[PDB]
Structures are given as C-alpha cells and as structure tokens.
Amino acid sequence: AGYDRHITIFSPEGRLYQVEYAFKATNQTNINSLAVRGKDCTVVISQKKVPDKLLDPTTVSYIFCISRTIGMVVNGPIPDARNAALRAKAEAAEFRYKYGYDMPCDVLAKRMANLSQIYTQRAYMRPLGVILTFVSVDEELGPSIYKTDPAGYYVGYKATATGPKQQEITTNLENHFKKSKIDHINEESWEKVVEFAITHMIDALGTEFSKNDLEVGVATKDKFFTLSAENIEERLVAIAEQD
Amino acid sequence: TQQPIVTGTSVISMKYDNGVIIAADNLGSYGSLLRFNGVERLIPVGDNTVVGISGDISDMQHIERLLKDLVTENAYDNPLADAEEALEPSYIFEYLATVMYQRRSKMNPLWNAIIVAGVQSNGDQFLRYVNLLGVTYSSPTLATGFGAHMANPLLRKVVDRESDIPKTTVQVAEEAIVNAMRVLYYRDARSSRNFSLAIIDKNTGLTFKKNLQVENMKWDFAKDIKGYGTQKI
C-alpha cells in the first residue's frame, strides 16, 4: 500500500515516488553542469570536483562521449552514470550498424528516454537517478542539446544547465538568451562558446573555476569531445581576458 | 566428348548494307587465367569469308587447319577454285555446320561456337552462326556468348531487323562493334581489351583488322565509389 513510494506504482495521486526520489539522487552528486549549443558547436561544462588527493582526478567525469558525434553529460551517481553511457554506447553503433548512419542525438535521448519509462512502469526495474543531457552537432540538426530525466522525459534545448544550482545558470542563460534572443550562442569558435559558457557558468554559479574545477566538453560537427585542463586553462586564461 | 579447356572468348558480328563486320579478341582463355592474347578467333578464308570461333582453341586450331584443306581441296582439279569455283561463305558454313552437329550427334562434339562472316559471291552478306550443338542460325547481327547477351542488343539496337541492314554502313556498325568490344571489354572478366576485327564487304571484300584495343572506357567516376556501401571513407 504505502509501498507505492517504495515502488513504482501510481500513488493515490497517480505519482511515482521512487521516480520523485530518483530525482533526489540526481543532484545527490551535487554537480552543476551546463549544455550550450554554440553557433557551430554545442558545448557542455560541468563541475569537476576533486575532493581527494588519493583520487586519480583525471578519472572523474560525468560528461561522456557517446558516439563519434554524440557525447552526453550525466547528472547522477557514477555507477548509474557509467551505466547509461554504456547503454547509450550500444544504441549508437547499433543504430549506425542497423541504420547505416549514426544515431541522431535526440534519438538516443528518445531511446534512453524510453528506458526509464520502462522501469517507471516496470516495478522491479528501478529507474536510474541520473539526469542525462545528450549533445552533438547533428548532421541534420547541427548543434543539439537533449536532456533526459530519470523519468524518461526529455526535450530539446536551445541550451541548458543542470545540477543543484541549475536554476541559477538556467536563469542566467534564460536571462542571457531572452537577452540574446537566439537559441544558440552565436560564436564560430566553440572556444568563445566555451568562454561564453565558462563565463556564464562562473557567472550564475558566482563561482570561479580552476581547470581542475571543470568538466568541460564540446559537441562539434561530426565529433563530440571534451577538453584537457589546458583548453580549460585556455578558457580560464581566455575568459580571464574578457574580464 | 569434351569440355572447354583452352578457350576463346565471345565472337561478335553483324552484316551491314554493303557487307559484314566481325570482331573477336586476340586473347584466348585457359580457366580464369587469360592465357594467350596470341589467339586469333577471327579466321579469314578467302576474301568473301572470315570465321569467328569461340570455345576450344585446339578444336579451333584443329578446325582452322581443316579449312585450308578445303581451299587446297577446292583448289584441286579446279581451275576456277579462284573463280566462281572458289569457296563460298555459304558453302564453308554449310560444310562446317554438318560437322558440328555430327560431332555433337556423335557425342564427340567440337567445343566451339562459331559464326561464319561472309559476303557472298553475288555480294550478299553472309552472316550465319553455328554452335557446338551444330544448331545454326543467321541474322543481321551475330554475337556470341557474353557478347550475344550484351552485343546483340547493341547490334540489334543497331539493326533491329533486316530492313535496317541496307541502311547500315560499315562504320556505323563497325563503331558499335568496337563499342560493343569495349562494352564486352567492360563487363566480361574474359573479354580482352586488345582484339581483332574483320569486315567482308560486297565491294572491298575482306577488310581485316588487328590488335584493336578497346578504348573510350570511363574509369573515372569509380574513384567516387567508397566501399560497397555505407562506408563513407
């Protein structure tokens, strides 16, 4: 009965608390992150938090390169993180294998979206407490941002952030986008797009970032990728130049 | 009782308004090995007659040697063996066709498909085919085998029917021949780029041609084709 929270079954309200609690697990990692479609590119920035020395910090990412074209950022636990990318990893080549051309980003999203809805509907299946944002520069759709939830719900974004402080950057970019009025950051060098972002990440997070602070990635045409700390550093340096 | 061993490629021919045209490669083939480009599959006999032969060369070799004899025989006791008592594309064909069918019917066929390119003593284009089955037929165009499949269409597209022939110059067909030659040399593993051609004309008589090389092939666009498929690089 009260199990309705323990499990996925319609609450008296038709609600799914594990889901709602999976939502808890999402920022449970407490990593704030963003996805911004540049003009050419899509760029994703996130908090690289290195609590320990004993870490190999390099090993730490929630931004995952899904395909040739597609990467994704995870918001959620690294086990569940490491899972969906794997899950995602299959579909791409799969899709590509099956379909002769690479999977469009949202397709993966829509795909991965299907997944939790299953577990959502599949009681013993638990949904995953990760929030996922897929990005690429799509041969069709060019720069692309698709965030998915533990609920299998998903949508396209002119850009997005995600994390505990998501709303803040959300506002920031919403501010800046309602300002800028165009879906994408208009910059030809993703660098600028990054630099724009790291700005507006530093901006809304009110947070200066070292190069070890940032999980940084860029979806570019035909290649999603990320940066070393040095491009980051370059962003740290470059962004220190605008200001 | 036999099988192809030393094998001649397809033979193609057609008769034009004033005469006939025929070509076969200079190659001859042993298995996938294209063993001898020293193989002339077009065999002239007299002016009026040339013979295309495909299949067994040793047969053909054998065959051809039999033919001179006919001349030398037609020579014997024959002042006019040069004159009207000369051999005729009809005759030679007619003679030959008997053999194969027999050889066939003997269950010892001669392994070959053969066209007799001729233009008759009255100047009539003699174009008529004979197989190792000894079944024969005549038609404005005769191509053999691989050619018969591709070239006959071309040359039937050249001459759809008889009425086309009197309209059909040498070169118009001749062109299509070499074209068909390329065409065949396009699409056949066995086809040779180098080939020979003959033309018996009711007027010029025999016009034979050597070492004709298939040309005018487009190999360019091939570069544009990547893998077999979805491979994009």
Contacts of B112 (CB under 8 A, 6+ apart): B8, B53, B54, B55, B56, B59, B60, B63, B100, B132
Torsion angles phi and psi, residue B75, rounded to 5: -60, -50
**Contact criterion met (CB below 8 Å) for B112 and B99:** no
At residue A83, what are phi and psi to the nearest 5 degrees? -70, -60
8-state DSSP, A68: S
Environment class of B152 (CB within 10 Å of its CB; exposed 0-12, middle 13-18, buried 19+) = buried
The backbone region for A100, taken as left when phi is positive above 0, alpha when psi lies in -120 to 50, beta otherwise, is left
Beta-carbon contacts below 8 Å between A and B: 3
How many other C-beta atoms can be found within 10 angstroms of the C-beta atom of residue B109?
A: 22
Rounded to the nearest angstrom, the minimum Cα separation between A99 and chain B is 9
Residues paired with B130 in a beta bridge: B114, B136
Cα–Cα dist B224/B229, whole Å = 12
d(CA B6, CA B2): 11
Token pair 């051999």: residue:
B87
Which two three-digit tokens encode residue B232?
């994009």
Q: Are B130 and B100 in contact (CB under 8 A)?
A: yes
User: Chain B: nearest CA to A222, how far in angstroms?
Assistant: 13
Task: Centre a 10 Å sphere on the Cβ of residue B21 and count the other Cβ atoms it contains.
Answer: 33
Which residues in chain B have their CB less than 8 angstroms from residue A93's CB?
Answer: none
How many Cβ atoms are within 10 Å of A224's Cβ, its own excluded? 28
Chain A hits for B230, Cβ within 8 Å = 100-101
Catalytic-residue membership of B1: yes
Structure tokens at B174: 């001749």
- B229·A100 Cβ contact <8 A: yes
Assigned token pair, A231 = 């491009």
CB contact under 8 A, A101 and B230: yes
Does A101 lie at the interface with B, CB-CB under 8 angstroms? Answer: yes
| Burial readout B121-150 (b: 16 or more C-beta within 10 A, e: otherwise) | beebbbbbbbbbebebebbbbbbbbbbbeb
Quickly list DSSP for B136-195: EEE-SEEE-HHHHHHHHHHHHHH-SSGGGGGG--HHHHHHHHHHHHHHHHHH-SS--SEE
Q: Which of B193, B150, B174, B145 is nearest to B9 (CA)?
A: B145
Which residue numbers of B have CB closer than 8 Å to A's CBs?
Answer: 229-230
Asked if A14 has any chain B CB less than 8 Å from its own CB, the reply is no
Helix locations, chain A, DSSP H: 3-6, 17-28, 78-99, 105-121, 166-180, 190-204, 229-242
Cα–Cα nearest to B24, from B149, B106, B142: B142
Q: Is B109 helix (H, G, I), strand (E, B) or coil?
A: coil
Query: For residue B159, which amino acid is it?
Result: V
Find, in chain B, the residue whose alpha carbon is nearest to that of A97: B230
Which bin fits A62, alpha (ψ -120 to 50), beta or left (φ > 0)?
alpha
Pairing of strands B194-201, B205-213: antiparallel
Cα B80 from Cα A173, distance rounded (Å): 107
- DSSP-based helix, strand, coil % in chain A, nearest 5: 40, 20, 35
* Fold of the domain spanning B1-233: Glutamine Phosphoribosylpyrophosphate, subunit 1, domain 1 (3.60.20)
Give me the amino acid identity at A50.
V
Chain B residues whose beta carbon lies within 8 Å of the beta carbon of residue A100: 229-230
DSSP symbol at B110: -
Q: Tell me, yes or no, if A97 comes closer than 8 A to chain B by beta carbon.
A: no
Q: Which of B230, B231, B232 to mutate to test the interface with A (most CBs of A within 10 A)?
A: B230
Q: Which two tokens stand for residue A135?
A: 């990005």
Domains in chain A (CATH in brackets) are: 2-242 (3.60.20.10)
Sign of the CA dihedral A64, A66, A70, A73?
negative
Experimental method of this PDB entry = cryo-EM
Active-site residue (options: B1, B136, B144, B169): B1
Q: Which DSSP letter does residue A15 get? A: -
Reduced to 3 states (helix: H, G, I; strand: E, B; else coil), residue B208 is: strand
Q: How far is A105 from chain B (nearest CA, A)?
A: 19
Q: Which residues of A touch B229 (CB under 8 A)?
A: 100
- Phi and psi at A198, nearest 5°, equal -50, -40
Which positions in chain B touch A95 (Cβ < 8 Å)? none
Nearest-angstrom CA–CA distance, A56 and A73? 20
Burial letters A139-170, b for 16+ CB under 10 A, else e = eebbbbbbbbbbbbebeebbbbbbbebbebbb
**Nearest-CA residue of chain B relative to A102?**
B230
Distance from CA of A100 to the nearest CA of B (A): 6
Distance (Å) from the C-alpha of residue A97 to the closest C-alpha of chain B?
Answer: 9
Closest chain A residue by Cα to residue B231 = A100
* 3-class secondary-structure state, position B197: strand
Residue of B nearest to A99 (CA): B230
Closest chain B residue to the Cα of A100, Cα to Cα: B230
**Residue spans per domain, chain B:** 1-233
Residue labelled with tokens 């000369």 = B86
